[PDB]
Amino acid sequence: RMVVLHSLLGMAVLIAIAVLLSTDRKAINIRTVAGAFLIQVALGALVLYVPQGRDMLGEASKTISNVIAYGNNGVDFLFGGLVSEKMFEVFGGGGFVFALRVLPMIVFFSSLMAVLYYIGVMQLLIKVIGGFLQKMLGTSKAESMSAAASIFVGQTEAPLVVRPYIRRMTESELFAVMSGGLASVAGSVLAGYVQMGVPLPYLIAASFMAAPGGLLFAKLLVPETERTQNKPTNVIDAAASGAVTGAQIAIAVGASLLAFVALIAMINGIIGGVGGWFGHGDLTLQAILGWLFSPLAWVIGVPWSEAGIAGSLIGQKVVINAFVAYSEFVKYLKPEAAVQLSDTTKAIISFALCGFANLGSIAVLVGGLSIMAPKRRKDVARLGIKAVVAGSLSNLMSAVIAGLFTGLSGASV
Amino acid sequence: VVLHSLLGMAVLIAIAVLLSTDRKAINIRTVAGAFLIQVALGALVLYVPQGRDMLGEASKTISNVIAYGNNGVDFLFGGLVSEKMFEVFGGGGFVFALRVLPMIVFFSSLMAVLYYIGVMQLLIKVIGGFLQKMLGTSKAESMSAAASIFVGQTEAPLVVRPYIRRMTESELFAVMSGGLASVAGSVLAGYVQMGVPLPYLIAASFMAAPGGLLFAKLLVPETERTQEKPTNVIDAAASGAVTGAQIAIAVGASLLAFVALIAMINGIIGGVGGWFGHGDLTLQAILGWLFSPLAWVIGVPWSEAGIAGSLIGQKVVINAFVAYSEFVKYLKPEAAVQLSDTTKAIISFALCGFANLGSIAVLVGGLSIMAPKRRKDVARLGIKAVVAGSLSNLMSAVIAGLFTG
């Protein structure tokens, strides 16, 4: 449909922003940033365009969906009938208890990855992916493994593999670690997204395209100007330790959502009353955020008929967090739809919202990353807003790639 | 009966004096001023239907602010807090852990933002500073009182949270006392559904703030006295929400314990009577029979305090609620042992308040996180603050019987 030219416009804009906000445009390693963009667009051309790639994506998703099903066996064991099919016969659409359907999945996956770390399975994958990035982008060992580890584990405990390297890494390396942690999504939280209604194959592609895309806008904003350098008892224990850690994470998540949803509703109450003085008492923050990020939604490849809707979802993902944005996005994926969003639009939003690139994850990074290296606490906080932008643009980049290779009319139910 | 009421107030204060730490340190300007505000606001809403609409709407306006907190709860638990609960389970459909405790997360996150944008900072400097001239209180002491009139006991120490760390013995006991006697929100609508007159409920709602200060500035006045950070606003709301999360856990767990403990305490007494002729002998009746003479002092002259006394005993032990549930069984024209209006007005005020034994759990468990180095000083005054909270509620009963005849 000759939309391949329109998609090239989206990619050009996002890269341009990073170059304009660079600390040293003359030190931008072209071999690194053009390679990162080449790899990121290659993965999008693989699991979305070619037939063989979509199989590997659907295959990997059929496996994970089974894993989630196994995790549901533990959920049905803990809360019993409160997560059964009878809940829909008693409370209708309210039978879906978010605290008992989504949050418990964070606990299971946190303990599952704890087991994979113990065995060495996770260490193996990070080494391979990380080793590939440093060999194709020319990045250092630390920031390559960091982006590779961020594909799976959490944003807090900012990937433990880089523990000794953080203390003496450059500003470009440290920023690459922070960017990778924001441009990507924790594997533990991902299973929660699936239970909400977010398309699984899109979440898989976005997680792997977060590593090269994370290093992309990290080297664009802050290019390397200096020189780089270079336990549980048993498996049962490791499985139990990850469960406890995952428990306090879900609690922190469920509490943050109960507050944010309430506070946003409170803000809309203010604008709903104040706006009534100008004749717009139905004006909400959702709208305002949509009207603001409306042009940006047009750039990535979303039609203007649905650009105002995608504006709020991308906006909330930045000014608040990902869970709130996704909660108001799965509503458009329902069969009985108030808005019939196109397949090429729902695909872009699913990739643009996938990431920890929000204002709330700044102190989250500063807090956890400073534990490993307190001497760099002043550098992390200073690159706080910069890391969010680097992470946000990375997710926006994957969104444009998504919209380009969904031009093959690849529907997502 | 005006002399009988003055007799009631004297005795209600005399008990506080006998249980006070330092009598010579008692500020005469503060305490006498507190009693003046309690009797003033009482007649302001009882006699004149102008303040009943002003203060009445004030409570509804502030409650609608907290009501936004339900939008986040309905999103989290979904249908476990819908109306379908009352159609299936009925009265048991009200889940305390899902309708009350999650609200603590909102307050801990809401005021995490207000302190960040300096709104609560102003409300302590202005409202607290104003009552700092009215009485020599630390204004971190007074703001908690003004807040408690609109927020619950689980949501009252959260208001002056960052002041509890470097807080003295007096201000600590005063904030807690305010929490004990304070009524707000979800229960404010509950009592109305019971049939007990709304104008009476508003009168006691605004009598908990000066009444809480009335006894807390008696049992322990001020001595040696009165004198990491979030990055973004979103972060503050996040940090606050996670902080409130563990608070609700600490409070709910303590409540689950104390309630079961009191119920276990009720057993032993039962068995000892179980040896012996008297006994079903619940702690409710025992503390209730001790309130019977004290009831006559307030009002309810005789052949009435024998029952009304046992209703107050239930107030200290198990609940406010149980006492009301039985009081509503006396207002019913099945017409046994019917009582006067000046009688029911006293009992309604004497029963209004959440200063029960179980409520201490909210304090100890709640302040275990806001100020963990202070919880040891909390339980030491736990029972003492129930006493200060119960006498505060009884003080309104005396003003009730006086200004209803």
Added chain:
Amino acid sequence: PRMVVLHSLLGMAVLIAIAVLLSTDRKAINIRTVAGAFLIQVALGALVLYVPQGRDMLGEASKTISNVIAYGNNGVDFLFGGLVSEKMFEVFGGGGFVFALRVLPMIVFFSSLMAVLYYIGVMQLLIKVIGGFLQKMLGTSKAESMSAAASIFVGQTEAPLVVRPYIRRMTESELFAVMSGGLASVAGSVLAGYVQMGVPLPYLIAASFMAAPGGLLFAKLLVPETERTQNDAEVLAENEDEKPTNVIDAAASGAVTGAQIAIAVGASLLAFVALIAMINGIIGGVGGWFGHGDLTLQAILGWLFSPLAWVIGVPWSEAGIAGSLIGQKVVINAFVAYSEFVKYLKPEAAVQLSDTTKAIISFALCGFANLGSIAVLVGGLSIMAPKRRKDVARLGIKAVVAGSLSNLMSAVIAGLFTGLS
């Protein structure tokens, strides 16, 4: 009758023999100590299960604690309301039993309950007497005796505050006795949790008091005392750093502690049950390549622990079922093993088990003798004495065996006198 009681002795012998073979110094085994422990263990079993006067005391204790649990439910019904009511069975039916709201809250109350009695002094009194009896009949030291006695009520070696002044300088035979006593026993908080699931209360009461002499039994069998036990006059440990101030504070202190335990337990169960279901999914697919796609981890652990189950007095027609239960209790934990065991107790059961079998399983599965409790020992016991952390980690697997053998020993004794009705 006379052939089933001769079986039991054989089983006991087999259990003891394993400990002797796995001994570091068989020649140093104090016969007066180990034979006394086995005598005491088998005496308590013969008392509360065989004689009429003993069963009345066990029943009276059961009726007493049952009332405590009933009082604990008053706090549970208060917090969750109708979600733990009778209407749950009229709606969700069998799914009306929410484990996270029926069992886990009980851990909170009992933790706060035992916290109160530690304040009063009732706990120190019971531990001192039982501990004093174990040191005057077995010849064990003061420390390990109090530890084994304290592990009857509180457990998981989180509250042997009595031996905190002793651990730093005690011998390995003493240290192992502490580790064994923790795994061989349970906790008051988790015992109440087992009751709500459906586990027979009188069996849990008998097993808890049998865990003290049984814990010291295989502890002195595996590693006898070869050095000198430190006497009282030397102990010089110092600070209290006390949480209690009054009974009100202690009641809330144990409540919050019981909460984070109930949360950790509930989280670890959600993981373990799911992970096993995931393994069963793997074996379910891989096993189909050999013609057995219905093969599960429950099955394997059944045939693997089938010989061990048989010895302790369980009929072969029921040995396969008791295999998976004992197995899971060791390789996973006690809650999971009990979760699949209470299904055989309900009248709607698929397979009916005999009275002499359900008693054996109930006693065998009672204890923290599992592979996941090792780190909790090393983790919690090292805070009191970090210089002994390297020694505790090594005796980790040995302690689990000691703890498991203790639970297996109490199982044989149970099936002996429950068979002799």
